[PDB]
Protein backbone atom coordinates (compact mmCIF):
# COMPACT_ATOMS: atom_id res chain seq x y z
CA UNK A 1 0.00 0.00 0.00
CA UNK A 2 1.00 3.46 -0.85
CA UNK A 3 -0.41 6.96 -0.21
CA UNK A 4 1.23 9.79 -1.64
CA UNK A 5 -0.45 13.50 -1.28
CA UNK A 6 -0.03 16.26 -4.37
CA UNK A 7 -1.37 20.00 -4.27
CA UNK A 8 0.52 21.85 -0.79
CA UNK A 9 1.96 25.67 -1.32
CA UNK A 10 1.17 29.10 -0.60
CA UNK A 11 -2.02 30.28 -0.40
CA UNK A 12 -3.15 33.81 -0.24
CA UNK A 13 -5.75 34.06 2.84
CA UNK A 14 -9.11 34.04 1.18
CA UNK A 15 -7.51 31.73 -1.16
CA UNK A 16 -8.51 27.95 -2.49
CA UNK A 17 -6.36 25.25 -2.95
CA UNK A 18 -6.61 21.46 -4.41
CA UNK A 19 -4.90 18.66 -2.72
CA UNK A 20 -4.85 14.92 -4.15
CA UNK A 21 -3.78 11.70 -2.89
CA UNK A 22 -2.61 8.66 -5.05
CA UNK A 23 -3.41 5.39 -3.41
CA UNK A 24 -2.33 1.93 -4.79
CA UNK A 25 -2.08 -1.78 -3.76
CA UNK A 26 -5.60 -2.28 -2.29
CA UNK A 27 -8.79 -1.89 -3.83
CA UNK A 28 -9.63 1.92 -2.83
CA UNK A 29 -13.20 2.05 -3.58
CA UNK A 30 -13.83 -0.62 -0.62
CA UNK A 31 -12.32 1.68 1.98
CA UNK A 32 -13.49 5.13 3.96
CA UNK A 33 -10.61 7.61 2.88
CA UNK A 34 -9.62 10.37 5.50
CA UNK A 35 -7.95 13.64 5.60
CA UNK A 36 -6.24 14.66 9.01
CA UNK A 37 -3.56 17.70 9.41
CA UNK A 38 -1.21 18.56 11.82
CA UNK A 39 -0.46 22.47 12.38
CA UNK A 40 3.72 23.16 13.44
CA UNK A 41 4.19 21.58 16.72
CA UNK A 42 0.71 20.88 17.61
CA UNK A 43 -1.43 17.49 17.07
CA UNK A 44 -2.93 15.17 15.01
CA UNK A 45 -6.46 16.82 13.94
CA UNK A 46 -8.96 14.95 12.14
CA UNK A 47 -10.21 16.69 8.75
CA UNK A 48 -12.70 14.96 6.92
CA UNK A 49 -13.75 11.41 5.98
CA UNK A 50 -15.48 9.99 2.83
CA UNK A 51 -16.94 6.76 2.59
CA UNK A 52 -15.55 4.19 -0.06
CA UNK A 53 -17.20 5.39 -3.41
CA UNK A 54 -18.67 8.57 -1.82
CA UNK A 55 -22.04 8.62 -0.84
CA UNK A 56 -21.26 9.45 3.03
CA UNK A 57 -18.91 12.25 3.84
CA UNK A 58 -17.97 13.89 7.18
CA UNK A 59 -15.78 17.17 8.18
CA UNK A 60 -14.62 18.51 11.28
CA UNK A 61 -16.31 21.56 12.43
CA UNK A 62 -13.82 23.80 12.04
CA UNK A 63 -13.65 23.04 8.02
CA UNK A 64 -17.34 22.99 6.70
CA UNK A 65 -18.79 24.65 4.39
CA UNK A 66 -14.71 25.79 2.79
CA UNK A 67 -13.51 22.43 2.46
CA UNK A 68 -14.90 19.69 0.22
CA UNK A 69 -13.62 15.97 -0.35
CA UNK A 70 -13.85 13.70 -2.99
CA UNK A 71 -12.63 10.61 -5.03
CA UNK A 72 -12.25 9.09 -8.07
CA UNK A 73 -12.81 5.12 -7.58
CA UNK A 74 -11.41 4.51 -11.08
CA UNK A 75 -8.03 6.66 -10.77
CA UNK A 76 -7.48 5.72 -6.97
CA UNK A 77 -7.20 8.89 -5.62
CA UNK A 78 -8.71 11.07 -3.01
CA UNK A 79 -8.91 14.80 -3.07
CA UNK A 80 -9.26 17.69 -0.65
CA UNK A 81 -10.58 20.66 -2.57
CA UNK A 82 -10.04 24.02 0.12
CA UNK A 83 -11.83 27.58 -0.61
CA UNK A 84 -11.91 30.83 2.01
CA UNK A 85 -8.73 29.45 3.76
CA UNK A 86 -7.58 30.78 6.86
CA UNK A 87 -4.35 31.35 8.29
CA UNK A 88 -4.89 28.74 10.80
CA UNK A 89 -5.18 26.49 7.98
CA UNK A 90 -1.81 26.19 7.87
CA UNK A 91 -0.33 22.89 8.73
CA UNK A 92 0.90 19.35 7.28
CA UNK A 93 -2.48 17.27 5.61
CA UNK A 94 -2.38 14.02 5.48
CA UNK A 95 -4.01 11.26 4.11
CA UNK A 96 -4.87 8.08 5.84
CA UNK A 97 -7.04 4.52 5.38
CA UNK A 98 -8.07 3.56 8.71
CA UNK A 99 -10.20 0.83 8.76
CA UNK A 100 -4.37 -2.14 9.19
CA UNK A 101 -4.21 1.53 8.62
CA UNK A 102 -2.29 3.51 6.65
CA UNK A 103 -0.97 7.14 6.16
CA UNK A 104 0.34 8.82 3.57
CA UNK A 105 3.93 11.19 3.45
CA UNK A 106 2.33 14.85 4.13
CA UNK A 107 1.61 17.70 2.11
CA UNK A 108 2.63 21.09 3.22
CA UNK A 109 -0.46 24.18 3.07
CA UNK A 110 0.97 27.66 4.34
CA UNK A 111 -1.54 30.44 4.51
CA UNK A 112 0.18 33.83 4.65
CA UNK A 113 -0.17 36.79 3.23
CA UNK A 114 3.98 37.03 2.63
CA UNK A 115 5.30 36.26 -0.74
CA UNK A 116 6.96 33.60 -2.25
CA UNK A 117 10.64 33.81 -1.91
CA UNK A 118 13.54 31.74 -3.72
CA UNK A 119 16.86 30.58 -1.67
CA UNK A 120 19.93 31.84 -2.59
CA UNK A 121 22.57 29.14 -1.95
CA UNK A 122 25.76 29.66 -0.66
CA UNK A 123 28.94 26.90 -0.75
CA UNK A 124 30.58 26.21 2.48
CA UNK A 125 34.04 25.20 2.41
CA UNK A 126 35.76 22.19 3.99
CA UNK A 127 38.94 23.88 5.63
CA UNK A 128 40.82 12.34 7.83
CA UNK A 129 37.75 13.96 7.34
CA UNK A 130 36.48 17.05 6.03
CA UNK A 131 32.64 18.84 6.60
CA UNK A 132 31.93 20.76 3.62
CA UNK A 133 28.11 21.63 2.97
CA UNK A 134 25.50 24.02 1.36
CA UNK A 135 23.75 27.20 3.35
CA UNK A 136 20.10 27.50 1.77
CA UNK A 137 19.50 31.18 2.59
CA UNK A 138 16.05 33.45 2.72
CA UNK A 139 13.12 31.41 1.61
CA UNK A 140 9.82 31.00 1.96
CA UNK A 141 7.47 28.71 2.40
CA UNK A 142 8.68 25.62 3.22
CA UNK A 143 9.80 22.91 2.07
CA UNK A 144 13.34 22.61 0.41
CA UNK A 145 15.20 19.24 -0.30
CA UNK A 146 18.87 19.02 -0.68
CA UNK A 147 20.95 15.75 -2.30
CA UNK A 148 24.33 15.55 -3.13
CA UNK A 149 25.62 14.62 -6.32
CA UNK A 150 22.82 14.12 -7.86
CA UNK A 151 22.08 11.33 -5.15
CA UNK A 152 25.22 9.60 -5.68
CA UNK A 153 26.32 10.86 -2.16
CA UNK A 154 24.02 9.45 0.67
CA UNK A 155 26.66 8.55 3.35
CA UNK A 156 27.67 11.26 6.05
CA UNK A 157 24.82 13.65 4.60
CA UNK A 158 22.97 15.62 7.38
CA UNK A 159 20.55 18.14 6.39
CA UNK A 160 19.33 20.31 9.20
CA UNK A 161 15.91 21.58 9.75
CA UNK A 162 15.29 25.15 8.80
CA UNK A 163 15.40 27.96 10.91
CA UNK A 164 12.20 30.54 10.94
CA UNK A 165 14.31 33.59 10.89
CA UNK A 166 12.38 36.94 12.14
CA UNK A 167 12.14 38.28 8.98
CA UNK A 168 9.68 35.42 8.18
CA UNK A 169 11.74 33.93 5.44
CA UNK A 170 13.71 30.28 6.38
CA UNK A 171 17.12 29.41 6.04
CA UNK A 172 18.59 25.79 6.68
CA UNK A 173 21.96 23.95 5.77
CA UNK A 174 23.27 20.87 4.41
CA UNK A 175 26.27 19.22 5.57
CA UNK A 176 28.64 16.34 4.55
CA UNK A 177 31.71 14.40 5.92
CA UNK A 178 34.26 13.19 3.93
CA UNK A 179 37.44 11.68 3.18
CA UNK A 180 40.27 14.91 3.32
CA UNK A 181 41.63 13.02 0.86
CA UNK A 182 39.35 13.36 -1.20
CA UNK A 183 39.32 17.56 -0.96
CA UNK A 184 41.14 18.06 -4.38
CA UNK A 185 39.58 15.76 -6.83
CA UNK A 186 35.96 14.86 -5.96
CA UNK A 187 33.70 17.09 -6.95
CA UNK A 188 30.91 17.83 -4.35
CA UNK A 189 27.45 19.54 -5.94
CA UNK A 190 24.43 20.13 -3.71
CA UNK A 191 21.37 20.07 -5.41
CA UNK A 192 18.66 22.28 -3.72
CA UNK A 193 15.49 22.33 -4.97
CA UNK A 194 12.24 24.81 -4.13
CA UNK A 195 9.62 23.77 -5.69
CA UNK A 196 7.40 26.63 -4.65
CA UNK A 197 9.76 29.02 -6.61
CA UNK A 198 10.53 27.21 -9.17
CA UNK A 199 14.25 27.29 -8.24
CA UNK A 200 16.60 24.59 -8.98
CA UNK A 201 20.89 25.12 -7.78
CA UNK A 202 23.14 23.01 -8.05
CA UNK A 203 26.19 24.48 -6.28
CA UNK A 204 29.32 23.38 -6.71
CA UNK A 205 31.46 23.60 -3.28
CA UNK A 206 35.23 24.04 -3.58
CA UNK A 207 38.05 23.82 -1.24
CA UNK A 208 39.52 27.21 -0.38
CA UNK B 1 -19.41 13.24 22.40
CA UNK B 2 -16.39 11.25 22.20
CA UNK B 3 -13.18 12.45 23.84
CA UNK B 4 -10.04 10.39 23.98
CA UNK B 5 -7.42 12.17 26.57
CA UNK B 6 -3.59 11.43 26.62
CA UNK B 7 -1.33 12.26 29.53
CA UNK B 8 1.18 15.17 28.07
CA UNK B 9 4.35 12.77 28.68
CA UNK B 10 5.54 10.00 29.94
CA UNK B 11 9.18 8.07 30.41
CA UNK B 12 10.73 4.57 31.47
CA UNK B 13 14.45 2.92 30.96
CA UNK B 14 16.15 1.70 28.50
CA UNK B 15 15.35 -1.69 28.57
CA UNK B 16 12.62 -1.82 30.30
CA UNK B 17 8.86 -1.48 29.54
CA UNK B 18 6.39 1.35 29.49
CA UNK B 19 2.49 1.52 29.33
CA UNK B 20 0.46 4.60 27.97
CA UNK B 21 -2.73 4.75 28.71
CA UNK B 22 -5.91 6.81 26.54
CA UNK B 23 -8.90 7.11 28.30
CA UNK B 24 -12.20 7.27 26.82
CA UNK B 25 -14.83 9.52 27.51
CA UNK B 26 -18.28 8.40 28.99
CA UNK B 27 -20.58 7.18 26.18
CA UNK B 28 -18.58 5.32 23.98
CA UNK B 29 -17.15 2.15 26.49
CA UNK B 30 -17.03 -0.50 23.12
CA UNK B 31 -14.92 1.36 20.28
CA UNK B 32 -11.37 0.25 19.09
CA UNK B 33 -8.45 2.49 19.37
CA UNK B 34 -5.60 2.70 17.21
CA UNK B 35 -2.22 4.12 17.89
CA UNK B 36 0.37 5.90 15.53
CA UNK B 37 3.64 6.73 16.55
CA UNK B 38 5.33 9.75 15.31
CA UNK B 39 9.24 10.70 15.25
CA UNK B 40 10.46 13.85 15.06
CA UNK B 41 10.23 15.45 11.96
CA UNK B 42 8.31 12.91 10.33
CA UNK B 43 4.89 11.33 9.39
CA UNK B 44 2.84 9.16 11.64
CA UNK B 45 3.25 5.77 11.62
CA UNK B 46 0.48 2.70 12.82
CA UNK B 47 1.11 0.48 15.34
CA UNK B 48 -1.52 -1.17 16.18
CA UNK B 49 -5.32 -1.83 17.09
CA UNK B 50 -7.05 -2.30 20.30
CA UNK B 51 -10.87 -3.13 20.30
CA UNK B 52 -12.63 -3.29 24.18
CA UNK B 53 -11.82 -7.24 24.18
CA UNK B 54 -8.20 -6.33 25.19
CA UNK B 55 -7.13 -8.13 21.72
CA UNK B 56 -4.87 -6.65 19.46
CA UNK B 57 -3.99 -7.17 15.43
CA UNK B 58 -0.76 -5.07 14.98
CA UNK B 59 0.86 -3.31 11.45
CA UNK B 60 3.45 -4.49 9.68
CA UNK B 61 6.99 -4.33 10.56
CA UNK B 62 6.27 -3.16 14.19
CA UNK B 63 8.28 -5.62 16.65
CA UNK B 64 6.42 -8.12 18.78
CA UNK B 65 7.59 -6.11 21.90
CA UNK B 66 4.97 -3.76 20.93
CA UNK B 67 1.56 -4.79 22.40
CA UNK B 68 -2.24 -3.80 23.57
CA UNK B 69 -4.71 -4.27 25.98
CA UNK B 70 -8.06 -2.59 27.54
CA UNK B 71 -9.21 -2.11 30.84
CA UNK B 72 -12.56 0.18 31.49
CA UNK B 73 -12.53 3.22 29.76
CA UNK B 74 -8.97 3.01 29.64
CA UNK B 75 -6.77 1.79 26.72
CA UNK B 76 -2.77 0.62 26.48
CA UNK B 77 -0.06 0.58 24.69
CA UNK B 78 3.01 -1.50 26.33
CA UNK B 79 6.16 -1.58 24.68
CA UNK B 80 8.81 -4.19 26.36
CA UNK B 81 12.62 -4.10 25.82
CA UNK B 82 12.57 0.12 25.11
CA UNK B 83 15.36 1.57 22.69
CA UNK B 84 16.41 4.83 21.86
CA UNK B 85 14.11 4.68 18.98
CA UNK B 86 10.77 5.01 20.85
CA UNK B 87 11.52 8.30 22.03
CA UNK B 88 8.51 9.51 20.16
CA UNK B 89 5.27 10.95 20.02
CA UNK B 90 2.39 8.68 20.75
CA UNK B 91 -1.67 8.93 19.52
CA UNK B 92 -3.93 7.63 20.12
CA UNK B 93 -7.50 7.42 17.81
CA UNK B 94 -10.82 5.65 17.20
CA UNK B 95 -13.82 6.18 14.66
CA UNK B 96 -17.49 6.63 15.78
CA UNK B 97 -20.37 7.41 12.94
CA UNK B 98 -18.07 9.00 10.46
CA UNK B 99 -16.38 11.04 12.66
CA UNK B 100 -12.74 10.32 13.58
CA UNK B 101 -11.05 11.52 17.09
CA UNK B 102 -7.63 11.73 18.32
CA UNK B 103 -6.17 11.28 21.41
CA UNK B 104 -3.78 14.59 22.15
CA UNK B 105 -0.65 12.56 22.44
CA UNK B 106 2.33 11.33 24.69
CA UNK B 107 5.44 12.16 24.26
CA UNK B 108 7.70 9.60 25.20
CA UNK B 109 11.35 10.16 26.67
CA UNK B 110 13.39 6.74 26.96
CA UNK B 111 15.78 7.30 30.62
CA UNK B 112 19.22 5.66 30.90
CA UNK B 113 20.42 6.65 27.73
CA UNK B 114 24.62 7.16 27.77
CA UNK B 115 25.43 11.43 27.53
CA UNK B 116 26.04 12.43 24.19
CA UNK B 117 28.31 15.36 23.84
CA UNK B 118 27.65 17.70 20.63
CA UNK B 119 29.78 17.70 17.62
CA UNK B 120 29.72 21.30 16.27
CA UNK B 121 30.95 22.50 13.29
CA UNK B 122 31.33 26.80 12.63
CA UNK B 123 31.72 28.00 9.30
CA UNK B 124 32.08 31.57 8.08
CA UNK B 125 30.72 33.54 5.73
CA UNK B 126 31.49 32.04 2.32
CA UNK B 127 33.24 34.74 -0.25
CA UNK B 128 30.33 34.45 -2.63
CA UNK B 129 27.87 35.98 0.06
CA UNK B 130 30.28 38.38 0.88
CA UNK B 131 30.25 39.80 -2.55
CA UNK B 132 26.63 40.39 -1.99
CA UNK B 133 27.31 42.33 0.45
CA UNK B 134 25.73 39.93 3.25
CA UNK B 135 27.61 37.59 6.41
CA UNK B 136 25.86 34.49 7.76
CA UNK B 137 27.80 32.59 10.24
CA UNK B 138 26.44 28.57 10.10
CA UNK B 139 26.88 26.79 13.60
CA UNK B 140 25.69 23.16 13.22
CA UNK B 141 25.25 21.02 16.46
CA UNK B 142 24.50 17.49 16.18
CA UNK B 143 24.75 14.01 17.88
CA UNK B 144 23.43 15.22 21.27
CA UNK B 145 21.88 13.23 23.69
CA UNK B 146 19.51 14.54 25.47
CA UNK B 147 17.91 17.10 23.27
CA UNK B 148 18.62 20.40 25.15
CA UNK B 149 21.10 22.99 24.45
CA UNK B 150 21.96 26.79 24.48
CA UNK B 151 23.82 28.82 21.82
CA UNK B 152 25.50 31.57 22.68
CA UNK B 153 27.97 33.81 19.94
CA UNK B 154 30.70 35.79 20.94
CA UNK B 155 32.57 38.67 18.74
CA UNK B 156 35.49 38.44 20.15
CA UNK B 157 34.70 38.13 24.14
CA UNK B 158 31.52 39.95 24.40
CA UNK B 159 28.41 38.38 23.80
CA UNK B 160 26.28 38.62 21.06
CA UNK B 161 22.44 38.97 20.83
CA UNK B 162 21.34 40.82 18.05
CA UNK B 163 21.15 38.38 14.52
CA UNK B 164 21.42 35.29 16.06
CA UNK B 165 18.82 32.83 15.26
CA UNK B 166 18.63 29.52 16.87
CA UNK B 167 16.59 26.29 15.76
CA UNK B 168 14.60 24.42 18.45
CA UNK B 169 16.37 20.71 18.84
CA UNK B 170 15.26 17.82 16.62
CA UNK B 171 15.60 13.69 16.52
CA UNK B 172 18.03 12.06 14.60
CA UNK B 173 17.72 9.15 12.40
CA UNK B 174 20.09 7.71 14.46
CA UNK B 175 17.84 8.71 17.96
CA UNK B 176 20.04 11.55 19.20
CA UNK B 177 19.67 15.20 18.58
CA UNK B 178 20.33 18.43 15.67
CA UNK B 179 20.11 21.89 16.19
CA UNK B 180 21.69 24.98 14.23
CA UNK B 181 22.37 28.74 15.09
CA UNK B 182 22.75 31.27 12.45
CA UNK B 183 24.89 34.71 13.21
CA UNK B 184 23.87 37.73 10.45
CA UNK B 185 26.80 40.63 10.19
CA UNK B 186 27.20 42.91 8.03
CA UNK B 187 30.78 42.41 6.10
CA UNK B 188 32.47 45.46 7.87
CA UNK B 189 31.30 43.61 11.67
CA UNK B 190 32.48 40.38 10.19
CA UNK B 191 36.20 42.08 9.10
CA UNK B 192 36.69 43.94 12.39
CA UNK B 193 36.79 41.44 14.94
CA UNK B 194 39.49 39.06 15.53
CA UNK B 195 37.16 36.34 15.84
CA UNK B 196 33.73 35.13 16.14
CA UNK B 197 32.59 32.03 18.32
CA UNK B 198 29.81 30.15 18.54
CA UNK B 199 29.39 28.28 22.22
CA UNK B 200 27.18 24.97 22.82
CA UNK B 201 26.30 24.62 25.91
CA UNK B 202 24.83 20.85 26.58
CA UNK B 203 24.31 18.91 30.21
CA UNK B 204 26.14 21.83 32.29
CA UNK B 205 29.38 22.12 29.84
CA UNK B 206 30.47 24.42 26.82
CA UNK B 207 32.31 24.04 24.09
CA UNK B 208 33.30 26.63 21.61
CA UNK B 209 33.99 26.52 17.78
CA UNK B 210 35.82 29.62 16.40
CA UNK B 211 36.10 31.22 13.17
CA UNK B 212 38.28 33.98 11.45
CA UNK B 213 38.10 36.42 8.87
Known amino acids: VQLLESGGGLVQPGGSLRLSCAASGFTFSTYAMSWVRQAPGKGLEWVSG????????YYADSVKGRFTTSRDNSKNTLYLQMNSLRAEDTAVYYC???????WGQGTLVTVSSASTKGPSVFPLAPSGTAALGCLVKDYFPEPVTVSWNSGALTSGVHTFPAVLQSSGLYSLSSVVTVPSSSLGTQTYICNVNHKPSNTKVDKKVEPK | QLVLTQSPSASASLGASVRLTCTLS???????IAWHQQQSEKGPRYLMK???????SKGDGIPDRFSGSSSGAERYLTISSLQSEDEADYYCQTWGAGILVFGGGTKLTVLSQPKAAPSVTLFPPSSEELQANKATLVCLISDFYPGAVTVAWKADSSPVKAGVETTTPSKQSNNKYAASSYLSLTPEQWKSHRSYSCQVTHEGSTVEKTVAP
Open chain 2, 26 to 32: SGHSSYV
Open chain 2, 50 to 56: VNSDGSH
Open chain 1, 96 to 102: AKFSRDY
Open chain 1, 50 to 57: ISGSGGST
